[model samples]
Target: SQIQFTRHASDVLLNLNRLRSRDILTDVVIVVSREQFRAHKTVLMACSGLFYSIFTDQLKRNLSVINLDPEINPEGFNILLDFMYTSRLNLREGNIMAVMATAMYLQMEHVVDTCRKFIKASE
Candidate 1:
């Protein structure tokens, strides 16, 4: 296997780090199970298939605070949000299933892969 980096790739990594730093650019808030999570709407839309559909043509557009579904667990959502901003995860044994379920339900393909990789490690 070969690994290479261009200036564009380094810039992309820098931009992703900036987005994960929880700086001023985060504009949208999600209220999940009475807990609130801050995220960038465009970023979430880009990362999540379901979010793209919801925020693009559905009733969720132009909203500052979107309420998550009741069945969505806040604890699991925290992991999802972390993965969203950082593009990385540290999946633990106990929380993997819950986070995986949440990630899968939200159609976050990268996050699901993260979950699957860790789950497969135990098998």
Candidate 2:
């Protein structure tokens, strides 16, 4: 017999976001330029292929700090990090391109696809 809680995923994500906000149980730091964001390694790997590969490579060496490309917009990366934890994408006309570029750089296929669709729909 299999029992499933329909809201389990949402609850888990919500709690994770709360933890992230409180800087609790976080294991990794993502450095985007001068800005540093603390987050869970598992959550980042689960959401991003780039992070998965980077973490996998670093697992042997071990690191709590990861640096991202300088070209990526810090504000866009911040939004993407929030979206990763909360499953919400907040896009505006002015920042959409920055978000899209950051998502693409992070290898977040779903976010990239969503940004593409959003651009087309807006046009």
Candidate 3:
């Protein structure tokens, strides 16, 4: 069973804490309370990025990719829930790393692993 969240929406929480952590940005934008912000940030730091990275490292980087490189941009991650839900990987070469980083941060292991294999194969 999987937790059915729009993967990218959950990710926006990461982007939220990441981009908004700036004091200047918080000054100009409506930032959440420190407690709330910490909650979101903890998810990213504790679960999302931390979990994914640890999983990858623990698995010895074994990976598989079946034309999964379509998701090679962060922009795509932010737009379509289906992309994350269905694990669509359609994307451009230039955007591969960005997508990989985002998916990785979000603990989209299937997407992250596939992208890693695709990138290694490309090199």
TM-score of each: 0.77, 0.91, 0.37
Order the candidates by TM-score, highest first — what do you get?
Answer: 2, 1, 3
What's the candidate order when arranged by decreasing lDDT? 2, 1, 3
User: What do the candidate models score in CA lDDT, each in turn?
Assistant: 0.78, 0.90, 0.45
Clashing pairs in 3: 70-89, 70-90, 70-91, 71-89, 71-90
Which residues of candidate 1, in runs, are more than 4 Å off?
Answer: 1-23
Report the lDDT tens digits of candidate 2 across residue range 79-117: 999999888999989999999999998899888999888
Quote the positional error of residue 79 for candidate 1 in Å: 1.2
Residue 43, model 2: lDDT of 95
| Candidate 3 lDDT, 1-123, residue by residue in tens | 988777776676556555544522332211122211212222323335443353346462332211123333436444222343233467558767776776664666766777878878885
* Residue lDDT tens for model 1, 6-86: 566557745765865746577788898889877778878977887788789757687888887898878888888776766
Predicted model with the maximum lDDT: 2
Q: What is the lDDT of residue 47 in candidate 3?
A: 39
Model 1's TM-score against the true structure: 0.77
Clashing pairs in 1: none
lDDT of 3 at 52: 38
Candidate achieving higher lDDT, 2 or 3 = 2
10 residues in a row with least lDDT, candidate 2: 54-63
